[PDB]
Amino acid sequence: KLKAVLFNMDGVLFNSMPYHSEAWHQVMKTHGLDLSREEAYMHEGRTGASTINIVFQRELGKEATQEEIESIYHEKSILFNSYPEAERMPGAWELLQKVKSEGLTPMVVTGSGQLSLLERLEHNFPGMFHKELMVTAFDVKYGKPNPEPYLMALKKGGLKADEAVVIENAPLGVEAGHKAGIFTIAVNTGPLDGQVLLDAGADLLFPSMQTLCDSWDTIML
């Protein structure tokens, strides 16, 4: 039944998670808030505004103001962009070529609003993605772990949930894919215990994008 493969971006397509976790950790530290690199990784999937608000609630016992959200989001984006630009996750391009050769539609479903990465998708993965077949921070009211972004991806692609598969590296994205009713494959590309991804609702778990790519033609959907 499979028609489309819905990829997260950060930690699936780009090896950008060390940078995102460093930048969140450092900007929060500047603001006097403790967020470890691993706790930052655990927020992958959220929009930046949702991350900031939840960290304020957890650490300060209050909501972030709109000004705090915009300031901190810009600060983190500027710091992220100050690093040498993120490179591809090994295995992603090989997998995309396989998916496309099988007649399947690649899509991106991300909580990112980071234009530096979004505008590099075409040069990194030529011929794969299209803006009207992507969901980003710009498209959603509620991001991951709410199923909204994955539900929206299904609609953009004219798909039913049973015609798609989700490829996720982070538990909030796994949860969103699963709760959207879509079969969800976790790829453990970061510092987390794989069990965190299984417990978030992943139907399958692979230890890298390359191993997923190697097994791809035996996943019968």
Q: What are phi and psi of 106, to 5 degrees?
A: -75, 140
Closest CB 164 distance from Cl ion, rounded Å: 26
CB closer to Cl ion, 39 vs 162: 39
At closest approach, how far in Å is the CB of 63 from Cl ion? 21
Closest distance to Cl ion from the beta carbon of 213 (Å): 21
Specify the 3-state DSSP secondary structure of 65: coil
| Least gap, CB of 24 to Cl ion (angstroms) | 9
* E strands, 171-218, in order: 183-187, 204-206
Beta-strand relationship, 164-168 and 134-135: unpaired
Question: 3-class secondary structure for 106-164?
Answer: EEEECCCCCHHHHCCHHHHCCCCCCHHHEECHHHCCCCCCCCHHHHHHHHHCCCCHHHE
CB of 181 to Cl ion, least distance (A): 29
Nearer to Cl ion, 29 or 155 (CB): 29
Cα separation, 99 vs 213, whole angstroms: 9
d(CA 154, CA 183) in angstroms, rounded, equals 12
Nearer to Cl ion, 112 or 184 (CB): 112
**CB of residue 199 to Cl ion, shortest distance in Å:** 19
Q: Which is nearer to Cl ion, 110 or 114 (CB)?
A: 114
Residues that bind Cl ion (CB under 5 A): 17-18, 21, 77, 80, 114, 190
The residues that bridge with 134 in the sheet, in sequence order, are: 108
- Pick between residue 7 and residue 19 the one whose CB is nearest to Cl ion: 19
Which H helix or E strand runs over 84?
Answer: none
Paired tokens of 210 = 């390359």
CB nearer Cl ion, residue 17 or residue 167: 17
